[PDB]
DNA sequence: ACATGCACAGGATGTATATATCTGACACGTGCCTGGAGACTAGGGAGTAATCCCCTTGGCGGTTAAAACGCGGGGGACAGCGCGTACGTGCGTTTAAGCGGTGCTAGAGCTGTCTACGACCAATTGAGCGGCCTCGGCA
């Protein structure tokens, strides 16, 4: 068989706009820890997205 | 006589040999964008002289904290309970990993504008005349 066409993003499943997959990509390749949680980048993206929303509104 | 320092046992720690490969130092192509200098331009700045007004100064003077000092409460020092922390332990859930699939998010493009960037004009708020008036005043 083959992998899923138009498979839904971690971001849009969370309702976020920031790239949660890239947050996981960068947490892992950024060497911050040898293993990284699946909801860790959701939480981090949501905080960066919140700070981004607040600072841009002001 | 106390905190620091002595050698043994234990148990794992750093180690040496090994299989497998991808990280990274290198020559070369690459070809950018930086280093360079000059022509051109006039906005900005250098140096001097004017003089206002500010920080420094010496001071008067008060009143403040340091200074000397004692009362009594509470900080500093051991036994006694019990509650938390460090593991022991097996379970099982968590992410990692292979490398495809293929989505959209990327560099770089080109697009047409088209916000907002200069530059000009028409507002509202400032101290100095002008004539009036009264209060305060002299002879």
């Amino acid at each position: 068989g083959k992998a899923r066409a138009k498979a839904k993003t971690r971001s849009s499943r969370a309702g976020l706009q920031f790239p949660v997959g890239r947050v996981h990509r960068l947490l892992r390749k950024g060497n911050y820890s040898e293993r990284v949680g699946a909801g860790a980048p959701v939480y981090l993206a949501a905080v960066l997205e919140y700070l981004t929303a607040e600072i841009l509104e002001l």
Side-chain angles (χ1 to χ4, degrees), chain A residues 22-34 36:
Chain A
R22 194 176 301 175
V23 179
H24 206 219
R25 209 290 303 294
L26 292 173
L27 284 174
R28 288 184 284 99
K29 181 158 281 289
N31 211 79
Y32 295 100
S33 59
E34 58 265 43
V36 181

Side-chain angles (χ1 to χ4, degrees), chain A residues 35-58:
Chain A
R35 296 172 73 91
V36 181
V42 174
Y43 190 97
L44 179 52
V47 168
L48 296 172
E49 184 168 314
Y50 166 62
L51 291 168
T52 299
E54 191 78 65
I55 205 166
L56 291 176
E57 175 179 326
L58 295 169

